[PDB]
Amino acid sequence: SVVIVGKISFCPKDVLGHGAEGTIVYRGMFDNRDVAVKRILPECFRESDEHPNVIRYFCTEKDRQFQYIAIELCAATLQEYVEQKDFAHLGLEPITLLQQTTSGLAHLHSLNIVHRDLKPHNILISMPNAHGKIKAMISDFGLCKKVGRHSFSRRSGVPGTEGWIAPEMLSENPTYTVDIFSAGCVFYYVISEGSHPFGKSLQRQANILLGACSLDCLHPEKHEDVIARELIEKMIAMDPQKRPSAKHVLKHPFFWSLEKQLQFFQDVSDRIEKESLDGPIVKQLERGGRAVVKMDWRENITVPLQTDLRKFRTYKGGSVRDLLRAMRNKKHHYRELPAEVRETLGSLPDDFVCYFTSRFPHLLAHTYRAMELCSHERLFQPYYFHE
Numbered sequence: 001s002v003v004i005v006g007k008i009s010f011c012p013k014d015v016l017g018h019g020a021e022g023t024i025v026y027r028g029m030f031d032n033r034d035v036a037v038k039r040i041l042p043e044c045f046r047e048s049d050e051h052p053n054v055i056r057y058f059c060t061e062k063d064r065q066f067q068y069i070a071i072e073l074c075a076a077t078l079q080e081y082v083e084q085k086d087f088a089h090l091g092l093e094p095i096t097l098l099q100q101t102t103s104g105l106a107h108l109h110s111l112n113i114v115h116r117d118l119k120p121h122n123i124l125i126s127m128p129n130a131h132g133k134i135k136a137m138i139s140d141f142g143l144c145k146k147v148g149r150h151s152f153s154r155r156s157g158v159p160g161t162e163g164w165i166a167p168e169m170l171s172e173n174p175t176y177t178v179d180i181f182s183a184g185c186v187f188y189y190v191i192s193e194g195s196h197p198f199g200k201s202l203q204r205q206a207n208i209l210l211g212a213c214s215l216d217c218l219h220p221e222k223h224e225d226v227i228a229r230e231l232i233e234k235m236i237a238m239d240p241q242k243r244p245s246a247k248h249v250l251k252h253p254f255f256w257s258l259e260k261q262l263q264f265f266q267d268v269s270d271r272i273e274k275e276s277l278d279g280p281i282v283k284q285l286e287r288g289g290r291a292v293v294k295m296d297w298r299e300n301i302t303v304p305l306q307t308d309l310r311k312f313r314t315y316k317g318g319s320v321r322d323l324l325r326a327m328r329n330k331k332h333h334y335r336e337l338p339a340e341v342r343e344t345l346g347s348l349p350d351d352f353v354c355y356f357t358s359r360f361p362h363l364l365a366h367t368y369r370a371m372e373l374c375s376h377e378r379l380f381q382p383y384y385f386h387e
């Protein structure tokens, strides 16, 4: 059986879920798209602003009783993506998912919209498009699994959504900073494969009020975890005014490709070449630098790179600057290096950069913080967000 209401069709047997006041969601079609079709009693009293990572409400039609609303169809929630056993990613990896979620949020904030209740239940994973690709999209309605059915609601604290309360309830009208906190919590949730940064649910609110977060799954000597921690801690900062904007989160190293990581190192090295050892920039760079370099970096690299460097009496092993200079030197002269050196370093850029970030897990985090001094400069505008 089939119901046609203008440009929207659906089969009444294909029920996906139920909502309040006899609202119902069916699977259907609109304009050769598979869509969710929400049927509602009408309540009384912008296509040009669409974005791939915010859910689309395509069309509204009506018969004599109901309105029918065509809505962009999801395969799963982020809750299911993260939690379900053996869930196929289908080519959508966590960092990309979070990247897309933050883009949708930056878009909403660019329109002066605050979500206020961003959680795993309302970040939806799309059906695969014509090109076999899936995406994250932020929804106003959250979905909670209940066989082949889901409850949908816009409300915070409905059954199923208990450990994710709207941040405004744990505290001025809501600003972007509530969304960033929630995003920060979602970031950790995905990365930790289901944990909350404010602990188990019975103590979670109490922990949020005091800023007692614990990012235990992030190892303090792994480059990827050092970067993720750096960002996530800023996003869930107890003080709302220290939280970065969505566009600011998007510029963070957490999202940089290996090529971009290597280019950053190359650029700071170029920037600090003629800089005096006693100037403000090199001082910022050498402060706390002994731990970053593992006291002597020349004792923490491979024997073939060690041997090739021995000629360079210039490079000091206690120095963060000289490690960056050694890196930039060997990237620039890579072609002309001995076979054994190209082999130990591996290919440009991906193996090369990982040679150093695996050995020196604080190098990028430390260099990123230190080089904020040059953030307004033209060369570094790709790496930092400006107000």
Ligand SMILES: Clc1cc(NCC2CC2)c2ncc(-c3ccc4n[nH]cc4c3)n2n1
Residues within 6 Å of the ligand: 016, 017, 018, 025, 036, 038, 055, 071, 072, 073, 074, 075, 076, 077, 139, 141, 143, 149, 150, 151, 152
């Ligand atoms: Cl019950 C439901 C189920 C969906 N997919 C199929 C399930 C395997 C996952 C699904 N995809 C989008 C929506 C949706 C999205 C925004 C809405 N606003 N009001 C109602 C809305 C409904 N749903 N709902």
